[PDB]
Structures are given as structure tokens and as C-alpha cells.
Amino acid sequence: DWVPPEVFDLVAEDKARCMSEHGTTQAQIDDVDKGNLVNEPSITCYMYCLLEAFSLVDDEANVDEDIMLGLLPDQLQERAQSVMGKCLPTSGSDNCNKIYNLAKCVQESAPDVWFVI
């Protein structure tokens, strides 16, 4: 498991805020974590919200590739560059939908390392 244990407490406050803002349930997060994605704002806006909180996306859901790469371990760098080559730029009807399309692309491209917290 590539995910380090330190991340969980780091994101806790923002996670709670994002869920509350968007009406997100833990069940929805569990679902997307297992790779099942639907275009429901309560989960897609949650994903945008959490990325935004950690400066991974801007005000139009453009991904900051440098920041993203900086967060990922060494063994995932080339794979991420490859996945980002495929999945960026983001597109969609709004910020949450951009993130839905991105999540679908990333999950399909790298299912074995996919996760959502």
C-alpha cells in the first residue's frame, strides 16, 4: 500500500468540512474508493473540494501537476506523468464535473493505485 498513514489526520479537518458543505456521505466515498463513480455533485464536489484544499486544483479545476507529483512517491512518478498525459487537461460543465471526468479517466488508467479518502 503506497498510501502513507500520515495523510489521514492531515486531511481530517478539510474532509469533514467538504462532506458537510456538499452533502457527501461516507458510503459515497467508500463507493468511489472501490472504483464506482457516478456524476452526483455530492461526491464530485467533495472530490473537487478536497483537491482544492491541498492546492492540487485551481478555481477552474486545472490540476497543478508539479504539486501532484510532489505528493506522490518515487515509484509512482513516471506512471503519474503518463496518466496526467492522458487525463489532462480537465474538461466538463463545471468544477465538480471536471473532477468527475478526471476521476473516471484516472481510475480507468490506474485502477490498482486508485484511492479516495
Ligand X SMILES: CCCCCCCCCCCCCCCCCCCCCC[C@@H](C)CCCCCCCCCCCCCCCCCCC
Positions that interact with ligand X (CB under 6 A) = 3-4, 6-7, 10-11, 47, 50-51, 54, 68, 71, 76, 79-80, 83-84, 87, 99, 102-103, 106, 110, 113-117
User: What's the start-to-end Cα distance of the chain, in Å?
Assistant: 14
Residue 43 or 106: which CB sits closer to Cl ion?
106
The minimum distance between CB 116 and Cl ion, in angstroms, equals 18
Q: Show contacts with Cl ion in window 67-106 (CB under 5 A).
A: 88-90
Other CB atoms within 10 Å distance of the CB of residue 1: 6
Residue 60 interacts with, from Cl ion, ligand X, none (CB under 5-8 Å by kind)? none
Q: Provide the minimum distance between the beta carbon of 12 and ligand X in the complex, in angstroms, as a whole number.
A: 11
Q: Which of residues 12-51 bind Cl ion (CB under 5 A)?
A: none
